[PDB]
Each structure stands twice: as structure tokens, then as C-alpha cells.
Amino acid sequence: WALGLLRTFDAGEFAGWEKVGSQVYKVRHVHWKTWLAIKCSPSLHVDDRERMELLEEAKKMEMAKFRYILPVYGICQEPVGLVMEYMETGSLEKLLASEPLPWDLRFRIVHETAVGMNFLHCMSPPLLHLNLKPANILLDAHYHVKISDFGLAKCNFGTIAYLPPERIREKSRLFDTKHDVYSFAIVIWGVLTQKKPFADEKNILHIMMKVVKGHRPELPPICRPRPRACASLIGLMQRCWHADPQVRPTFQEITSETEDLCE
Ligand SMILES: Nc1ncnc2c1ncn2[C@@H]1O[C@H](COP(=O)(O)OP(=O)(O)OP(=O)(O)O)[C@@H](O)[C@H]1O
Ligand SMILES: [Cl-]
Ligand SMILES: [Mg+2]
Numbered sequence: 001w002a003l004g005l006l007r008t009f010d011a012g013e014f015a016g017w018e019k020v021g022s023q024v025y026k027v028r029h030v031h032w033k034t035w036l037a038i039k040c041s042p043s044l045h046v047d048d049r050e051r052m053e054l055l056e057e058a059k060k061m062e063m064a065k066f067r068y069i070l071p072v073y074g075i076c077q078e079p080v081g082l083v084m085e086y087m088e089t090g091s092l093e094k095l096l097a098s099e100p101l102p103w104d105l106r107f108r109i110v111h112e113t114a115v116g117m118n119f120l121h122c123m124s125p126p127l128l129h130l131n132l133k134p135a136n137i138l139l140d141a142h143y144h145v146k147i148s149d150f151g152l153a154k155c156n157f158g159t160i161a162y163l164p165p166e167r168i169r170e171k172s173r174l175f176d177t178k179h180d181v182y183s184f185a186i187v188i189w190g191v192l193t194q195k196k197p198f199a200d201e202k203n204i205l206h207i208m209m210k211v212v213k214g215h216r217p218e219l220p221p222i223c224r225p226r227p228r229a230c231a232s233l234i235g236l237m238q239r240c241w242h243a244d245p246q247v248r249p250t251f252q253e254i255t256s257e258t259e260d261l262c263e
Pocket of ligand 1: 022023070088090094135138148150
């Protein structure tokens with residue numbers, strides 16, 4: 001059902017190719033008189049593993065069409081690329097590095113992210129994102145969230161930070177919803193601090209092992225402008241990164257809590 005509504009694009013349809021990635025381009029679609037985004041494959045050869053995986057990525061984005069999930073329009077062949085809605089503000093990662101953000105916006109970003117993740121986990125069967133980090137949380141012109149980057153999702157280096165400890169303890173464990181919950185904990189931490197996690201520490205491997213034994217990013221202090229809400233968010237964050245997956249809350253329980261923070 002997913003591959004049906006998608007379109008094949010041709011590069012002549014696009015103009016004004018302008019790098020936004022980190023490769024991703026903002027392109028004008030001339031006939032539609034609107035801008036779109038296209039994520040082009042890095043590889044030198046137009047490989048058949050990729051062309052099917054980019055389709056998978058697109059197909060999974062269409063299955064989770066929702067307010068807080070990036071819309072997807074289809075595929076380009078001429079350059080192999082995934083075609084999708086353009087988000088004017090860009091990534092959360094970029095926003096956290098740009099300037100201090102008002103607290104009420106921080107709580108809204110967190111909530112909206114939680115709402116979208118809840119939507120994925122409520123599908124039948126659940127859809128695990130497995131790559132939730134600020135670089136894949138996109139923000140529209142009005143700073144509303146749309147989750148993106150479904151390359152690793154399953155219907156069954158920055159990344160070590162977002163990796164759950166059970167994924168380091170066990171070779172080849174079954175992916176579950178509790179993976180996404182841990183990663184979300186590390187997303188909250190970044191929103192609280194506006195820092196990248198472990199950006200100080202040099203021995204990546206040493207930190208890995210410490211994490212297996214319950215070590216996490218340093219807790220931020222309670223902020224002056226919204227100390228009640230901030231304390232509540234820090235507390236939620238901590239339950240979300242618990243070492244035991246089964247103790248971590250569900251996104252159903254999380255969204256209930258983050259909604260109260262937005263008042
Ligand atoms: N729709 C979009 N609108 C605007 N900027 C985008 C969009 N999609 C991605 N970007 C930007 O480009 C970056 C590329 O991220 P994206 O996850 O899409 O590609 P990727 O990480 O290379 O993918 P993959 O994991 O499949 O190799 C984002 O972090 C963001 O800064
Ligand atoms: Cl408060
Ligand atoms: Mg990405």
C-alpha cells in the first residue's frame with residue numbers, strides 16, 4: 001500500500017539545489033511552486049541495495065503519516081534520493097547550538113517529540129525508530145517538531161550516546177520500544193543543557209563500559225525560570241535512561257507527563 005502513493009521524481013523537476021545536510025538539499029520544485037528536501041545517497045555507484053533501502057525508508061515514513069512525523073513525497077532516480085517536506089528551521093541539533101532557547105519552547109519540543117514517538121509505538125505492529133537523536137528531529141518555520149530519518153526503523157561518532165546499555169551488554173539483542181525510550185532520555189538531556197552528550201570525554205570506550213554499569217550524562221542544575229517543570233523533566237529523563245529496560249516508562253506514560261509540562 002505504501003509504494004503506491006509515492007511518486008518518481010526526475011531531476012529536471014528541481015532547481016536551486018542548496019546544501020542543508022550534515023547529503024541533503026533544499027530544492028525548488030518548479031511546477032509546484034514550492035520547496036522540498038531531497039536526501040541523496042553518498043555512494044559513488046547507484047547500488048541496488050541502497051535503491052531498495054531508500055524505498056523502504058520512504059515506505060515506512062508513509063505508513064506513519066502523522067502531524068509529528070515528516071511527510072514524504074517519493075523518490076528520485078536520476079540522482080538516487082528520497083524526496084520529502086522541507087523544514088525551514090532544520091534540525092534540533094543545529095537549533096541547540098545556535099542560541100539559548102526559551103524554556104516553554106524546550107518543553108514543547110520535548111512533548112511534540114514524545115507525541116510522535118508514541119504514534120510510532122501505537123502502530124500495529126509497533127514501529128521502532130532506533131535512530132532518535134537531535135539531528136533527526138526537524139523543526140518547521142514555527143518551531144514545531146517533525147521526526148525524520150527512518151533508515152534504521154524496523155516493523156518487527158554521535159550514535160554511542162543514544163545507544164541503550166543493553167545493546168552494549170548483549171551481542172545481538174532483540175530491538176524493542178525501550179531502545180527508543182533510552183534515546184529520548186538523551187534527547188531530553190540535550191534540550192535541558194543545549195550541549196552534545198559526552199562531547200568533553202575523550203575515551204569513548206571507557207564511557208561505554210561505565211554506561212553498562214549505570215553511568216549517564218551529568219545532571220543539569222535546576223533552572224531559574226521554570227524550576228518546577230525543569231525538576232519534573234530531569235526526573236522523567238532519569239527514569240527514561242534506567243539501566244533496566246523494563247523499568248523505563250512507555251511513551252504512553254511519558255506523553256501524559258510532558259503534556260503537563262506545557263502549561
Ligand atoms: N526535510 C528536511 N528539511 C530540512 N533539513 C533536513 C531535512 N531532512 C534532513 N535535513 C537536514 O539534513 C540532515 C541529514 O539528516 P538525515 O537523517 O535526513 O540523513 P542521514 O542522516 O544522512 O541518513 P541515513 O541515516 O539514512 O544515512 C539533518 O540532520 C538536517 O540537518
Ligand atoms: Cl515551573
Ligand atoms: Mg540522520
